[PDB]
Design a protein around this ligand. Structure first.
Ligand SMILES: CC(=O)N[C@H]1c2[nH]c(C(=O)Nc3ccccc3)c[n+]2[C@H](CO)[C@@H](O)[C@@H]1O
Ligand SMILES: CC(=O)N[C@H]1c2[nH]c(C(=O)Nc3ccccc3)c[n+]2[C@H](CO)[C@@H](O)[C@@H]1O
Lengths: 447, 451
């Protein structure tokens, strides 16, 4: 029994009910099976976790939860009291129990408590009662689990949720030792890998942590998350996780880009990864590059779908004529690929620009003929980025357009300027302030 | 009779009909009077300008247009055929006329044709008929104006819409000379100032262009526009335009931030500017900003028992957003060519602290006592940016939060890192997550250009 799907677990503008219904639809089509409701800034999830849902809010959650059952996706409600709960106050524990009973009235059978992103300092009352921060968390968690009748799937996200957050390391952490010994066996534990955004999750890192917490964990995967950097989007393939992991894990829930429509590849490729080795034996039949092409070829068909004049010989041609192509989306993904890696064409544009700039002073037959055609070849590629933008700009599926618009505009702006610089090397409005104030502070730090 | 209000004229995700109704409401409250519909990427405005509105789309525009009349705001429908219209084809002129009469069926009396952001190269058919690119534009424009019964308000946006786009300059441009001589007198002309994003619009620049186009222009102001830079937001006051301009202008329509809720200051301060000299001691940008933020503050506690003990952990949400929080936020995200006082000041102190870092380990009391307290004072201010973020994060008006979230998160992330660097400089006889790749690929190209 493997939990595989999406966690809406990011900071900023949560997804709306229409979009979450559409997610369940896509999860089912791709044979994924789980959704974890945990938007950091949906106010009643974390900030105002004590407040009960209003009647209007209750109706919308009921409809959402029925939608999940309709598409055979497990709905897990998570809640995050960590910032200001007094763990030892029964009033407080009761308020929590009320909130979770209210949601089970909506049709929800599966739950989670999250203690990611808080500090370890308890108040004085909690210090007296509980001998450590883990002892307090495991107390209310085991209690809530029992009060709800020991539900089939109940998740706990630790404060020390990855390799680099474990004090002083994973195998000797007093926080995790306590979680493994005292947290009841039928509660599953969330884990993001060796780091918060793990480039790779080695099998041996999972064996390690699996010993100290005493279960196979469920992975909260931040590979395609983009809440942490305004300028970033991730359209590259699920990567850096061996299919070998699957028999050593309880699940994988990916926390993907904030912009709903940009997660076609992120979720599609996760599904191809899961489906490739669904139930193994306790080294890959999964190719990230092949998975990316499957995903983009399918995504392409969404762009011509909402969510005569044919000019003469002498006349100005339709600006809309040409539709988005597979090569356009292949280019876009390489430009906005993965947290620790650009895609081939992106890496390659950067390498040619680095070369062209460093060998500029040349402007000798040998070196000129090289620089001139290399530069013309680079203008042509910068041309391909403009062409991509323009064809996206005209596509019928405006919903997708709007989710990406600001990223596609940014990359074509920069390539358009970079093209101008290379044209200016061959010939011998707000921009000084670029990135605003934040940009100026960033330029004064060791990059 | 002065046209003052907002043009929705930017690139990216247009505003939705609920938000435009709310805009009319705000325009009325502040005694502004005009809205110009012109979203670059609302598909039937420009890309698919030939396509008529569907029944569903027609109902929504009708409701929007009635909403405008209800709030006493002039509704101006603009259209942008410039990218692919063949000017000399009657079929093409007819398709344009159809589109504009469809919208007048919806209740619209005021119109506009826009030729910003296209190149000057005409097709071969148009070269034969018309002797220049201006001659073509002024032809269809005068014709459409007459066909619509010479409406009281009709706007034309030129291709050469500012100082720096005028070939070879404004006073000797053949494009503009043609527009001034031949464009019919009762059509008004849009203009963005000396540049696309004008820091200042001098009175003498307006006198100049007013001669060659032969009217007072209407300003399309891009002062608070932010479609051109992912990381930028503008919450500073309307600034750099003298109240003297008003009797020399036909109007001012501001093209503000993409994120609807961030335009409280931009529009509020424009209204204070217009109202100050309706018919330059009279308008102070700094005073106007405080009026605006004090009013905005009241929206943050409005959606769009347990009281913890002595020994217990207090409510994390207890403290609400304050006026000082929003004053700080605006200085951090102020104007295109200028940061606000506190922002400028944080940057100056950081620049100083970094450059005088070596003072930490060298025997020097004078310079240490200075660096230590200057640094502590800087930690305190970086503290205030986190405090701002966290109180915004808890505010009841989630609509506003969500519009700004990504900007407020970015600045508090960077200040939090910048604080760590200054703490690390103070521990210098004493020795991770995605950051090398910060800004993504685009960031790497930007770092290799002369800034
Ligand atoms: C378990 C987890 O990933 N929790 C949150 C989380 N927490 C963190 C960090 O805490 N990161 C961090 C902390 C200190 C210094 C650098 C980075 C990142 N994330 C994710 C990516 O931004 C975010 O979406 C998520 O809500
Ligand atoms: C009249 C006008 O401002 N037209 C458009 C416009 N046009 C331009 C440019 O002309 N941009 C430009 C020109 C040369 C080099 C870089 C950018 C900017 N803008 C505004 C700000 O991006 C945009 O919101 C607007 O629709």
């Amino acid at each position: 029994r493997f939990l595989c799907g999406v966690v809406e677990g990011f900071y900023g503008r949560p997804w709306v009910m229409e979009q979450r219904k559409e997610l369940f639809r896509r999860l089912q089509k791709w044979e994924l099976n789980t959704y974890l409701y945990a938007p950091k800034d949906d106010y009643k999830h974390r900030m105002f976790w004590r407040e009960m849902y209003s009647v209007e809010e209750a109706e919308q959650l009921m409809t959402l939860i029925s939608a999940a059952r309709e598409y055979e996706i497990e709905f897990i409600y998570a809640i995050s009291p960590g910032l200001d709960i007094t763990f030892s106050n029964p009033k407080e524990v009761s308020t929590l129990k009320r909130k979770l009973d209210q949601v089970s009235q909506f049709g929800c059978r599966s739950f989670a408590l999250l203690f990611d992103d808080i500090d370890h300092n308890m108040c004085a009352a909690d210090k007296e009662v509980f001998s450590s921060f883990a002892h307090a968390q495991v107390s209310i968690t085991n209690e809530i689990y029992q009060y709800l009748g020991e539900p089939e799937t109940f998740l706990f996200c630790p404060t020390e949720y990855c390799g680099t957050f474990c004090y002083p390391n994973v195998s000797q952490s007093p926080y995790l030792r306590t979680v493994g010994e005292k947290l009841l066996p039928g509660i599953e534990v969330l884990w993001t890998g060796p780091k918060v955004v793990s480039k790779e999750i080695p099998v041996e890192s999972i064996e390690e942590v699996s010993k100290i917490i005493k279960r196979a964990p469920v992975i909260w995967d931040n590979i395609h998350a983009n809440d942490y950097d305004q300028k970033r989007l991730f359209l590259g393939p699920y990567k850096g996780r061996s299919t070998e992991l699957i028999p050593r894990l309880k699940g994988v829930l990916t926390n993907p880009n904030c912009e709903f429509e940009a997660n076609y590849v992120a979720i599609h490729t996760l599904a191809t990864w899961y489906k490739s080795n669904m139930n193994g034996v306790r080294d890959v039949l999964y190719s990230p590059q092949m998975a990316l092409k499957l995903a983009l070829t399918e995504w392409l068909q969404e762009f011509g779908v909402p969510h005569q004049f044919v000019p003469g010989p002498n006349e100005k041609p339709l600006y809309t004529a040409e539709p988005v192509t597979l090569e356009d989306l292949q280019l876009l993904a390489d430009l906005f690929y993965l947290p620790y890696e650009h895609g081939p064409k992106g890496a390659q544009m950067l390498r040619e620009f680095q070369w062209l700039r460093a060998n500029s002073s040349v402007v000798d037959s040998e070196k000129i003929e090289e620089w001139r055609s290399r530069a013309a070849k680079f203008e042509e590629m910068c041309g391909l980025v403009m062409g991509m933008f323009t064809r996206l700009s005209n596509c019928a599926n405006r919903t997708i357009l709007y989710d990406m618009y600001s990223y596609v505009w940014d990359i074509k702006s920069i390539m358009s300027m970079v093209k101008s610089f290379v044209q200016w090397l061959g010939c011998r409005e707000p921009w000084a302030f670029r990135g605003g104030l934040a940009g100026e502070f960033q330029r004064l730090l060791p990059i």
